[PDB]
Structure formats: structure tokens, C-alpha cells
Amino acid sequence: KSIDEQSLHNARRLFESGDIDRIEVGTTAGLQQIHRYLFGGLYDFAGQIRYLKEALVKIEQMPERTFEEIIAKYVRMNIAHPFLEGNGRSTRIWLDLVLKKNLKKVVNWQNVSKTLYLQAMERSPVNDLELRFLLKDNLTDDVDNREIIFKGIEQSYYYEGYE
Template sequence: MVLKNKLNITSQVELNKTEEKISKKKAIKLFDSGKINKINAGTVEGLQQIHKFLFEDIYDFAGFIRNVNISKGNFRFAPVMYLEQSLKNIEKMPQSTFDEIVEKYVEMNIAHPFREGNGRATRIWLDLIFKKELKMVVDWDKIDKEDYLSAMERSPVKDIEIKHLLKNALTDKIDEREIFMKGIDASYYYEGYDEYDIHKLFS
């Protein structure tokens, strides 16, 4: 079933392409405008702002906490009835060390607060925490898709793999546009969105 969208697209293939194109452009606009630096890193509100900015041209629910239960494969994300409290607890989690930041990220992934677009928004959110607290960001282009997906799948039980992957991909090039752009392409590729090279959208 195709998610209801503002563009009245009824084909999943067409929606995927359009969503990728529009939201990748919005991601770069978020960076180029400087708005990304005004987001309060590590907060639920900050994550909502990122999600809204990326997807507001496509979905009415952009930036809003979901009111339906969702799952992926055999994994059920936080039930709606516990989601609000779960997000409050996550926001209170410390974020001053690498381990604390990744643990907070893992918990936010388990919460999956939005109807769609969680991974893409939350990876930007994670980078903002790393940038604020450690003066580092993730060079996502260095992390293999299958390695990342399997590490995230296991992360609710064992987070050593995702910590290893992220630690080895950290860079101090925190304000470099190219790192951000390549990171967006990689982030979308993890989710199966690889129709558009972000550089060609701006050529």
C-alpha cells in the first residue's frame, strides 16, 4: 500500500523516486541555509525539525510523531502507547561521550518515531550530536550498507558492531559540504534509494 502523500502519487516506484529527489534537495538546503546549525542536537524536537524539513513537501505527517504501530521484518518498533514516554526517556539520555551518543542513537532507532523516513532523519540527528559534543561527524560513505544494516538489526541486543563501524568512520571535517552530500547519498542508499546522485541534482 502506497503511503498517502501530498503529490497524490499512487505508484510506489514513482513515490520512491520523487521522495528521494525532493528530500535530497531539501537535505542540501538544510545544510546550505545554515538552518542545520540552529537545531538543538540530541532533542526530540530537533529530530522532528529535521524530519519536517526533509519531507514536508511530500507528507502531511512530516515532523509529527506517528500514531500507528510499525514494524520491519520481524522487529516491532516502540508501540504507540509507550512512544511518548520512550521519547522523553531518550531525550534525557546523556550524550557527552562516543558510547553515550551511539547508545542514544540506538534507542531512537528502536523508537522509530515517524511513519516513514526515520533512518534518513535520525542519521542527520546523530551527526549533529557528534558535531556538538565531539567536534566530529560520520563519513557515511565509508560504511558498507550490509555491514550497517546488520549492525543496526543487532544493536538492540548488542551495540558493539555499530559502535565499531561508526568509530572507524568518524572525521573532523564537520563543516565540509562534500562530506555531508556524500553522507546523504550513502544514507539514502542504505534504505534502497539510489536513483539520484545528489551531485547531479545540483549540477
């Protein structure tokens, strides 16, 4: 928990300090920046990519105009699994930045049940319908609300077992 607990604080600091605004949106480098911030000083491979290189290039080039397009891009990044660890927590922040830029909305994760999220994610390689339906019902335009942000981060970490 000590690794996860310190990462949780890093995630909170990322938004509080406003450093989140310096993260490149929708790119591999951006995802690396997030991973580096979250696990810097914890994982030796923080911000480091574990073919995979060519797949990531194709993924970041995917369009981000619609919710459906954004989710499709998110699902391949998840399948890509670019880091040894910390993929889900970093990618979910990665997703929100993309949603905020293009749709001016983010996912209110605190209202996204663990059971429904994991099922939808597990199913997404075959069909992302479950994931699209779940996340779309939980979009909010209140993208700078700290309650939504901090509670969202807590839920995100809850998805992987930290509490």
C-alpha cells in the same frame, strides 16, 4: 523515487543554507525539525510523531558525553521509530549533530558500507558493538566539508534503497 528525490534535495538544502545550525541538538523537537525539513510538502505527517511519548522523553534525557553514550542514545531512538516513515535518514542527521556538538566529529557516511551498516543496525537492539566499531572507524573532525556532507547524505539515502 520522486518523493525520495525531492527529500534528497531538501536534505542538501538543509546544510547548504546553513539552516542545519538552527536545529535543536539531541532532542525530540530537534528530530522533528529535521523530519519536517526533509519531508515537508511530501509527507503529511512531516515532523509529526506517529508508551512512545514517554519513551522519547526518556531517550532525549540520555547523556551525550561519550561516543558510547551517544550511540546508546541513537540506538533507542532508532528502536523508538517515532515517525511513520523517514526515521533512518532523519535520525542519522540527528546523530551527527549530537556527535558534532559533544565530540566535534561527524560520521563520514560515504565510507560506511551499506552491508555493514544494516547488519550493525539490525544487531544493535541485542548488542551495539558492531555499530560502535563501524562508526568509530569512520569519524572525521572535518565537520564542515561539503564533500563529506553531500556524499554522506547520498549514502544515507542509499541505505534505504534510493539511488
